[PDB]
């Protein structure tokens, strides 16, 4: 059973979200960041139950559906536009080297034939990628930290990270490190 307070609240949430989305769409997609591409890890948090079609397709591309999903990404023009579009649902920022190393080591899963197997074996890692220049899990770690031409393939291969739900632990440049040890 569901009530008129929820109807009104959901409708106003949808209306304001539509207004803000139209605002960004009309405005120029220019963020106050240098033109250099960066590396940012993004973790999505449940903000609104119902999501507009554009943020839904962006979240589909970013494969962040199951609860507490995070993933690394290139900071560029189109990606920044998508992030600004999906701003309410995502919390993002610059990762640390220790942060990415710990994330990959503690929670690492490989995607092969639509299957999610843990990154137990470098043999499995190479049977998956093999010829792209990757030689091990540490090779993937170094690629992610210092992006190379194979970053897209590495991101596709690595399964999205499922962070543990914290018990209480906009954009911020650095506190994502605290948040990642919080959910790790």
């Amino acid at each position: 059973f569901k009530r008129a307070e929820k109807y009104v609240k959901e409708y106003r949430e949808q209306e304001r979200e539509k207004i803000r989305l139209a605002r960004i769409a009309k405005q120029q997609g220019s963020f106050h960041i240098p033109a250099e591409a960066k590396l940012v890890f993004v973790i999505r948090i449940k903000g609104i139950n119902k999501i507009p079609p554009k943020p839904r397709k962006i979240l589909q591309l970013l494969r962040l559906r199951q609860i507490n999903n995070g993933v690394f990404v290139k900071v560029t023009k189109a990606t920044a536009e998508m992030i600004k579009i999906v701003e309410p649902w995502v919390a993002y920022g610059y990762p640390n080297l220790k942060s990415v190393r710990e994330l990959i080591y503690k929670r690492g899963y490989g995607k092969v034939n639509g299957q999610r197997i843990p990154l137990t074996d470098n043999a499995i890692i190479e049977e998956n990628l093999g010829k792209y220049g990757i030689i091990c899990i540490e090779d993937l770690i170094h690629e992610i930290f210092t992006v190379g031409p194979n970053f897209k393939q590495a991101a596709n291969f690595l399964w999205p990270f499922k962070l543990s739900n914290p018990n209480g632990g906009g954009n911020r440049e650095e506190h994502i490190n605290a948040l990642i040890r919080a959910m790790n």
Binding site: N96, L97, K98, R101, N177
Partner: peptide, 22 residues
């Protein structure tokens, strides 16, 4: 004593500082 900034960057064993005398 161990320093937080270097530990965060990834000092690990290098983060801790050991002094022979108190």
């Amino acid at each position: 004593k161990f320093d937080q900034v270097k530990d965060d960057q990834g000092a690990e064993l290098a983060a801790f500082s050991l002094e022979g005398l108190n």
